[PDB]
Each structure stands twice: as C-alpha cells, then as structure tokens.
Please model this.
Amino acid sequence: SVRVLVDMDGVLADFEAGLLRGFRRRFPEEPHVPLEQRRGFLAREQYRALRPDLADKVASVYEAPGFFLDLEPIPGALDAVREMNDLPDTQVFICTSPLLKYHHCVGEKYRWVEQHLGPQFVERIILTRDKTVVLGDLLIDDKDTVRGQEETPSWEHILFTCCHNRHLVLPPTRRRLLSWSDNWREILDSKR
Amino acid sequence: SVRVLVDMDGVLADFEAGLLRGFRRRFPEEPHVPLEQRRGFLAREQYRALRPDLADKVASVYEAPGFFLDLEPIPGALDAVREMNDLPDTQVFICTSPLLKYHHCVGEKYRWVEQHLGPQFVERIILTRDKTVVLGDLLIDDKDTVRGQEETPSWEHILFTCCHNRHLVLPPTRRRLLSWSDNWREILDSKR
Ligand SMILES: O=c1[nH]c(=O)n([C@H]2C[C@H]3O[C@](c4ccccc4)(P(=O)(O)O)OC[C@H]3O2)cc1/C=C/CP(=O)(O)O
Ligand SMILES: O=c1[nH]c(=O)n([C@H]2C[C@H]3O[C@](c4ccccc4)(P(=O)(O)O)OC[C@H]3O2)cc1/C=C/CP(=O)(O)O
Ligand SMILES: [Mg+2]
Ligand SMILES: [Mg+2]
Model:
C-alpha cells in the first residue's frame, strides 16, 4: 500500500567513503577532499576544482573493477531496509542509476545486493537512469534534485542526508532524513 | 509525448532462436523443440515435458557466458525502435527483466544494447523484474500476461507475436503486433 523506492549509492552503499578510500590508496601523495569538506553531488567536479588532472584520477577509482562490489554499507541501512520490507502494507524496491561506463557497475551492484541483503532483495532491484518514470510513494535518495522525463513524479523525494548535501537549505515543503536512525517510520506512516 | 516501453527478450533480441541454437550445438543427440512448436512462455518447462533431463540442459544454455551477448536481433526490430525513438514527441525505453541467475545476464544485456543500438540507447535501459511499476503509455512485450505489484499499470500491453503465444486469441479490446512490419506507427499515433 505504501511503495518506497530506496536509492543504492549514498543511501545503502557508501559511495563517498569508498571513493575517498580508493583515491587515498591509489594516489597517496595527492591532495584529497575530506568527507566533511565535500560539497555538491558530483565528487569528480570538486576534485577537478582542487586541481584539473585529479578529475581523471578520481574517475579511475569509481571505474575500476571491484569498486562497487567492495563498498561498505551505510550505517544502519541494511537493518532499516530489512525492517521496512517486513512492515505490513509496505513494498520496497532498490532504485539505482548505473554509471554510463556500466561495465564494472551493473553486475557488481546485483552481487552487492545478493551478498548484503540476499537473493530476495535482488528481485527488487530497478536499474534506471531515470527515476521519475518509476512509480512509488516515496523516493529516499541523497541527490539534491532527482530529475527525468516526468516533470511531476509520483513519489515524494525524501533527501537522505550525506556530507555533500548537509549544508543544503530546503524549503519547508521538502523533507530530509538525517540518517537511518532518524524517524523513517513516521515518514512512511504519513503516506498511508 | 508518447512513452513506449519496449521489451528486450522476444521483441528486440531473439531469445528463442538463441536458445535452440545453443541447445543443438551442445546437445546434438537430444530431442528438441522446433521453433514453431514452442508453446507457453517458459521454454524450460516445455523441454521438461519433452523429457525431464532436458530441463537442466536447456537452463545450462541460457545460463552460459555469452548467451545474452550473442543473441541475434529480431527481424526489423532495431530499425523500428531507432525510427520510433527518432519520432517527434516520442520517448523509448528498453524495459527488460533479468534472470534470477543474473551473473552473465545483466552486463551482457547492457553490452548488447551498446553494440546493436549504441550508447544513447544504453541510457534508456530499465532493468526490473516488475514492469507494472514503470510509467509508460505502451509496453510492447511477448509475454502473455505481464504481472507485478501494480494491479492496474499505466501502460497498454501490446502483445508482440512469437511462436510461444500465437495460439492465444485476444479479445477485441486488446492488440497484438504480428511483427515489426506490422503497423506499429498506427498503434503509437493512436496514443497521441
Ligand atoms: O553518488 C554519486 N556520486 C558521484 O560523484 N558520481 C559520479 C560518478 C559518475 O556518475 C555519473 C552518473 C550520472 C547519473 C547517474 C549515475 C551516474 P555518469 O554520468 O558519469 O555515469 O555522473 C558523473 C559521475 O559522478 C555518481 C554517483 C551516482 C549515484 C547513483 P544514484 O543517483 O542512483 O545514487
Ligand atoms: O523470454 C523468456 N523465455 C524463457 O524461456 N525464459 C526462461 C529463462 C528463465 O527466466 C526466468 C525469468 C522469469 C521472469 C523474468 C525473467 C526471467 P527466471 O525466474 O529463472 O529468472 O524464468 C524461468 C526461466 O525461463 C525467460 C525469458 C525472459 C524474458 C525476459 P522479459 O519478460 O523481459 O522479455
Ligand atoms: Mg544516491
Ligand atoms: Mg520478452
């Protein structure tokens, strides 16, 4: 009865932490962007701002085999999604956009879900570059604005807080989840 | 804008021909189901009916590396979807369900679209086991019934004719496309 679309990167899987970890490992001498200093959704472009050739170095991290497979879960995310999926009159899909360089992204995302959440959740994956054409009541996603071919999506976007969006000032009509320890049940209840 | 959701297997990519090619190649002594004797969506179950050991043999074909990558296009399909996508006020997405055994399916489907239709079409893939949650005006799909969590999808299901579904006689209110040489433009225009 309430359908919740849950983003993967930035909500379930810690893309930012994995990016920084891989960058520091492969480019140990280079300046980096600490997580707390991250601003703006597109990490590559903050690195570009720091120094131009860092853009390609940071892309080489998220394009590498293993990158998606080895991401750590966001604290509390897995337990929240498991709990959420067991709620009566509640349907959960993992709604995730793959990279344009899809080669080591798409399969790895299925495998990450299989490992962390199990085969039953693999059946709930929707891979799409356009979330506005997917039907649901809520979308929990860390991107500032989620855009696509539907000017008016079916879902309300609930901004999942990450360091990169922490400083965004939202109008009163937009809601934010601070973390998975925040009151997501109340948000779901507000749509029943 | 008319948004067309186009199935991949059975509509763009010839799963049935690929299955039989691989089966004859790997299991030449075994009985097979000629293409035109296919009946029912689930190929494996017709093979099981023919002789029980053939169920696992035929699964080993569609589970193998390269199976999805090497499928031949359905006649006229690629020209049709390119033409369709190039039409004023028309948006195409490829809406496709991966196998539960996803390992050699998911990445190979992206690669098949990239090779056959190009990067602009890779951006239009929606991978989902539930098509009823995807918003569109039309879904062109060979499966006799397309089910999911949305009891009343937004799309009209246009049954794409294949040997396995040709025995079905649709009531006057439902539409079939006999092939891509059939008058698909009329079905699109009927939605504008
Ligand atoms: O969180 C992110 N942070 C980030 O810095 N990037 C990077 C990787 C690469 O991804 C893209 C991107 C755009 C849209 C959807 C998914 C991916 P790409 O266009 O290069 O593939 O965009 C610019 C680049 O920005 C992507 C992501 C993607 C998240 C997927 P989501 O929106 O489903 O959570
Ligand atoms: O056309 C088909 N014919 C066929 O015989 N099969 C086989 C492979 C394997 O696929 C499944 C299947 C079910 C639903 C969607 C996708 C795949 P699986 O449940 O094993 O993954 O079902 C039983 C098996 O039947 C699948 C397909 C899948 C097509 C995907 P689509 O509906 O998006 O075109
Ligand atoms: Mg995200
Ligand atoms: Mg099909």
